[PDB]
Design a protein around this ligand. Sequence first.
Ligand code: SF4
Ligand code: SF4
Ligand code: F3S
Ligand SMILES: [Mg+2]
Lengths: 534, 267
Amino acid sequence: SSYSGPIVVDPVTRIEGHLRIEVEVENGKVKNAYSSSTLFRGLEIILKGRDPRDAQHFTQRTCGVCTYTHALASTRCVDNAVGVHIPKNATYIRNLVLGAQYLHDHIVHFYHLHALDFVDVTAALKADPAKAAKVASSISPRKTTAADLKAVQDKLKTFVETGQLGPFTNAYFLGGHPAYYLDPETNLIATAHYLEALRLQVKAARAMAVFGAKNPHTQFTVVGGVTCYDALTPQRIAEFEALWKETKAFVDEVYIPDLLVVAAAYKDWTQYGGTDNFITFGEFPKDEYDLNSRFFKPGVVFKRDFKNIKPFDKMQIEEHVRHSWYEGAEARHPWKGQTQPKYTDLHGDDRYSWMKAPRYMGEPMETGPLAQVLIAYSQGHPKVKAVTDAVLAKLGVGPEALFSTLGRTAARGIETAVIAEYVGVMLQEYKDNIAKGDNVICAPWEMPKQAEGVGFVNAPRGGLSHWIRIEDGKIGNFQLVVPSTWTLGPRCDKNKLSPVEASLIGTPVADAKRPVEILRTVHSFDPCIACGVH
Amino acid sequence: LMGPRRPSVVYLHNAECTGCSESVLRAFEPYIDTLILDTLSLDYHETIMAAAGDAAEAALEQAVNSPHGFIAVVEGGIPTAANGIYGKVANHTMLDICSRILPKAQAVIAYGTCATFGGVQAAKPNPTGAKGVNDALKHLGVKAINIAGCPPNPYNLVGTIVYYLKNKAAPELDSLNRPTMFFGQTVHEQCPRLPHFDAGEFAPSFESEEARKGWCLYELGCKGPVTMNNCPKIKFNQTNWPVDAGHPCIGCSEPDFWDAMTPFYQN
Ligand code: SF4
Ligand code: SF4
Ligand code: F3S
Ligand SMILES: [Mg+2]
């Protein structure tokens, strides 16, 4: 007995921004998918004619979830256009704030955006807290007791008995759901840690404000470097280090053990949500002008061929509009980009999204943690290899399992663990540099009347690039090509399904009224529609 | 999703970057768990709610039609060009959604400069015709309390909601509808660099020894003198604010600041 017909999920919640997912299902399995982004703002249009130094302040407001990332990309872009080589300490401080962004972002994603697809919070009320504490203590070096977990259960019981379920109202798990598999005890452990993570993320975000002024929307970058002389002081460094160490402890002792326990319970999710091609830009440079100096290196992989990673050629990016709400059908390289809105309503003239459709050598590319992890693994990155092997061994699966919704979710945790450790290495290198007597954080520069620039960030959702053409000292063109544009944009003028659309084909759907399986795969890509469309 | 007991909040997302939602997650003493479990009932919020799709729309309808009443908190500007089509949720324009829901709220708080004044997507040439909530919905009699900033200090949202729940009334508001208890002083009059300003001690560049010694940032563009906010007093994340990180204020709690305060590095 299974469903044939359409399903629409609008709004897709527990993402950033405004997404409509449409699928066709045949006999209980998705046969076809459309990724429709339903808000446009037009920041590229707004930037025309302005001072290039102002760009980062506007583009940071592309997104407050991946806050900082676009200020960093625009600053790298204008740094590049003007030819300034920022001081070593500006690279360290920018890199440390970015590392802290990744930890905040991925913790919040797993617990506060993704986990309600897999955790039945109300079933936690049925759990035995003593048994749950035993299980929590067996998966982590941190000891959890029955009383620790009963406190959570007691608070949850008061909440549910009020009849005001708040954010849990009409949850797909209420009353039970055939695709929710966790036992009560594991639901209680995850619910406890969801709640804990609401307070831990405050500290993970504060780490960014220690050097970067505030979170959200940092204010310490300038063309040529950074502004925060106080970041050189031992007291601000100690403050950052203490917040980092507590955030890392949470990653290592709470997030990754929970990720592995939920993955182990949902091992069938190794069979859905795979994709073919991967792109990543690398991150955490030693040299701002050499992507191959980054701790994660750039790369391109087609058809899962990881023995043949291809170099990243920035000139092989084109953004399509044929199935998007923009004029015409011509794909453009972003240094020749165009943002000419033309709405035709849903599927009018075969157009169904405000995102453009970026293609690399004509192909749709997944970007984000799975691409960063798989490509760095295949480049022989020893930290990525150590963590990914340990994860596969704990789950008892082969490498092929990574090409899936479960694998992508696991890769997000892997990259969090690896970056959490690497933040301590960057912090020590920064300390050592200050101790050598280098106290410089900004370099002088001059605005050219005509220039091209590009800035590359591997953000928590993947390869981010900002592209400027300066004319008469002003912004002649400014184009953002953002990770979620790659992953969740629509089809191109060759009608190739985008990574999220292709990954949905084959998804089983147990209950079309509560299609949590579609959410599991969509959320595994960590969509950001404000990012994707800008 | 809520009946008696905790006051119901309906949180809407229009044309926004979700930085205002993230700012509320940074709430400190009380933290956001206290706020969601004890203080308030968050009955619709697309970033964190469990339900999606039709179930989410039904959650919204149940909250808005509750005989107990609800407070609306609105993030993002409303795109009004081309009959509202640049922003839709569940295939309804954001203009339609807010026009139908906000007149039913017991109180409306416009949270962030986009909801208060139009914000980044309303900057020139405003291709989507984005407007702040009170501008867009003037004709329906909506008068949202405006808590400005990009994003605002979450202290200012919690303090306004607490005041409203205690006194059943808005606090004193300024001529931009912002609470005077948070927005009654310029950033500049509260700034630690004010003695340098008075002494004509300005940093000439960010690389300069004067910037290193903490001289005033006015020549580098600081909009502190024309911006009303409580940043130097409350700070952000319990630890810092833009001028103490060496960067000028960009004027982010003021209407039309994207066009009025630019170029950001000039005064
Ligand atoms: S006010 Fe600023 S931070 Fe808030 S939604 Fe608008 S752009 Fe984002
Ligand atoms: S740094 Fe800005 S807010 Fe502070 S004294 Fe100077 S002009 Fe005023
Ligand atoms: S930029 Fe905004 S956050 Fe405060 S310091 Fe100026 S009003
Ligand atoms: Mg773009």
